């Protein structure tokens, strides 16, 4: 008898942790203890998905004494309106209901072309490089910081502004670093709401000032706007660096692929499925139980903290045949957990596929030779951020 503790040790850079894995094995969910709380880890597919539609389960901590949390952990909660336990329902349900239609068919049609052709530019000044070079840098990072200056109607070199500023909120190893970071998107995000009061364009903020003629305050108007900043670009970054890797370590697939750029799509959903990096713990969904809970023979209390493991649960071969095989030609594969599921479901996941697609469509077929230039073992993920990631990709072509 070891109680398991969270972050699991991981000898390779990408995949699940094997004692994870082991617990899957086990069964569907299992006591652990954390840096933290101890929690409830759910680890299978079924269980994960089902979970995650319970109106029982939800982000805000319903508890009288809750425990203490990083600067970084504390300002996402409070991005996403559950910081609250008893304003969370009305003021989450307004979230959603400001952000979905901000990103319409219309939009997504206009920036899937924008995107295109950004990306056609991307490669060529890479072509024409001389490798060594950094594809984290050069691609990785510039096409989703691209997205959302147009989303926010902002030049495309505000994003060297800010750029590092999602993984310095989210650095949960400073507090003081954390608070400055997002005492900077703040000031930014309100600056750019002043602008579009008397500078509207086609963009998020100048609907947002519109909707339901002006009842909106600035601060709500900037609150939304810093979730689209922090959330909108980073783990998009992420997933086109996990993308790259996964297809190098996969050649006749990545062969299938620059073949037949039609299997993109395909590529894109087993990228999310498989895209888990280093111990993985921003592939885990945490929640609070606001009512007791079965799962199996299992009681979730009132109160507990429970872990959602939408990686491991991504690797569930009772839902993927294979679980762990990077493969294109699936038949009718399950839909993956990478966005979520029901309340809190991903609200730029269309948008995010888009781009990944337009990206992977794109980059084997016009850099064939494309391959690391230092070994995978050197390659960091950075534990300490919410959103983990790696600083730089070397490559050469
Ligand atoms: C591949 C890239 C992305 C991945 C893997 C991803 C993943 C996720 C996941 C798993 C959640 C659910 C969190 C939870 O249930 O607690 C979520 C929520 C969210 N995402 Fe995405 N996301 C991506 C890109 C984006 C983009 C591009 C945007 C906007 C431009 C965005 C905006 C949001 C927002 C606003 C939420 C909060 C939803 C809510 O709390 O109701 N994300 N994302
Ligand atoms: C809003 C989020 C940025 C989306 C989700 C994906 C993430 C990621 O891929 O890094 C974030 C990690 O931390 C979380 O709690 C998550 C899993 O919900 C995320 C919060």
């Not at 069964?27 to 680890?43: F, S």
């Not at 800010?162 to 970071?181: L, P, Y």
């Not at 713990?281 to 903290?305: C, F, K, Q």
Request: with cysteine; proline share 6%.
């Amino acid at each position: 008898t070891d109680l398991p503790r969270l972050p699991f040790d991981n000898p390779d850079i990408m995949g699940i942790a094997p004692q994870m894995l082991a617990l899957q094995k086990e069964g569907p969910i299992a006591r652990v203890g954390t840096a933290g709380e101890d929690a409830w880890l759910v680890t299978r597919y079924d269980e994960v998905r089902t979970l995650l539609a319970d109106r029982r389960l939800r982000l805000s901590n319903p508890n009288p004494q809750p425990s203490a949390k990083s600067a970084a952990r504390a300002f996402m909660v409070a991005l996403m309106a559950g910081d609250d336990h008893e304003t969370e329902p009305a003021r989450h349900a307004q979230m959603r209901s400001l952000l979905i239609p901000r990103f319409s068919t219309r939009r997504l049609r206009l920036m899937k072309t924008r995107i295109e052709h950004h990306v056609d530019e991307l490669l060529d000044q890479l072509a024409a490089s001389a490798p060594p070079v950094d594809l984290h840098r050069v691609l990785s990072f510039r096409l989703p910081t691209m997205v959302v200056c147009d989303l926010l109607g902002v030049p495309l070199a505000d994003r060297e502004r800010f750029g590092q500023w999602a993984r310095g909120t989210f650095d949960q190893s400073d507090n003081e670093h954390s608070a400055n970071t997002f005492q900077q998107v703040v000031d930014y995000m309100l600056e750019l709401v002043a602008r579009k009061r008397v500078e509207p364009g086609d963009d998020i903020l100048s609907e947002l000032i519109a909707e339901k003629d002006g009842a909106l305050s600035d601060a709500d108007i900037a609150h939304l706007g810093n979730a689209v900043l922090l959330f909108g670009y980073e783990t998009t970054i992420v997933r086109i660096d996990l993308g790259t890797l996964l297809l190098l370590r996969n050649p006749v697939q990545r062969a299938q692929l620059a073949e037949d750029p039609g299997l993109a799509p395909a590529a894109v959903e087993e990228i999310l499925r498989l895209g888990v990096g280093g111990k993985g713990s921003n592939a885990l969904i945490p929640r609070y139980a606001h009512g007791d809970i079965t799962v199996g023979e299992t009681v979730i209390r009132t109160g507990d903290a429970v872990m959602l493991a939408i990686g491991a649960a991504n690797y569930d071969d009772r839902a993927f045949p294979d679980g762990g095989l990077f493969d294109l030609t699936r038949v009718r594969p399950r839909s993956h957990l990478a966005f979520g599921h029901g309340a809190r479901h991903c609200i730029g996941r269309t948008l995010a596929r888009i781009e990944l697609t337009a990206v992977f469509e794109r980059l084997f077929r016009r850099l064939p030779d494309l391959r690391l230039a230092v070994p995978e073992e050197s390659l960091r993920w950075q534990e300490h951020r919410i959103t983990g990631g790696f600083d730089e990709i070397p490559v050469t072509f």
